[PDB]
Amino acid sequence: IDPYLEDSLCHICSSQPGPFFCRDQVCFKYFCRSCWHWRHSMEGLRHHSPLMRNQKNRDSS
Ligand SMILES: [Zn+2]
Ligand SMILES: [Zn+2]
């Protein structure tokens, strides 16, 4: 079954669509700029990189 916005929202702030995701086993959840900085506030996880969830169209006509 496909996911929903009621389960793929931010899991810490639930105030944004969770536009990013963290691939490490200590995050493994969706985040926004706010809750991303809450799981990466310390220097120990600064090696993580956010995955995208949306992109621009290949046309602008
Ligand atoms: Zn992370
Ligand atoms: Zn968030």
Curated annotation (Swiss-Prot):
Subunit structure: Interacts with kinesin, dynein, APLP1, APLP2, TENT2/GLD2 and APP. Both phosphorylated and non phosphorylated forms interact with APLP1. Interacts with TENT4B; the interaction is required for TENT4B-mediated translational control.
Family (UniProt): Belongs to the RRM CPEB family.
Residues annotated for Zn(2+) 1 binding in this entry: C10, C13, C32, C35
Post-translational modification: Phosphorylated on serine/threonine residues by AURKA within positions 166 and 197. Phosphorylation increases binding to RNA.
Subcellular location(s) per record: Cytoplasm; Nucleus; Cytoplasm, P-body; Cytoplasmic granule
Role noted for this protein: Sequence-specific RNA-binding protein that regulates mRNA cytoplasmic polyadenylation and translation initiation during oocyte maturation, early development and at postsynapse sites of neurons. Binds to the cytoplasmic polyadenylation element (CPE), an uridine-rich sequence element (consensus sequence 5'-UUUUUAU-3') within the mRNA 3'-UTR. RNA binding results in a clear conformational change analogous to the Venus fly trap mechanism.
Source superkingdom: Eukaryota
Recorded domain comment: The 2 RRM domains and the C-terminal region mediate interaction with CPE-containing RNA. The interdomain linker (411-429) acts as a hinge to fix the relative orientation of the 2 RRMs. The ZZ domain (509-566) coordinates 2 Zn ions and is probably implicated in mediating interactions with other proteins in addition to increasing the affinity of the RRMs for the CPEs. A continuous hydrophobic interface is formed between the 2 RRMs.
Binding residues for Zn(2+) 2: C22, C27, H40, H48
Name this polypeptide is given: Cytoplasmic polyadenylation element-binding protein 1
Tissue expression remark: Isoform 1 is expressed in immature oocytes, ovary, brain and heart. Isoform 2 is expressed in brain and heart. Isoform 3 and isoform 4 are expressed in brain. Expressed in breast tumors and several tumor cell lines.
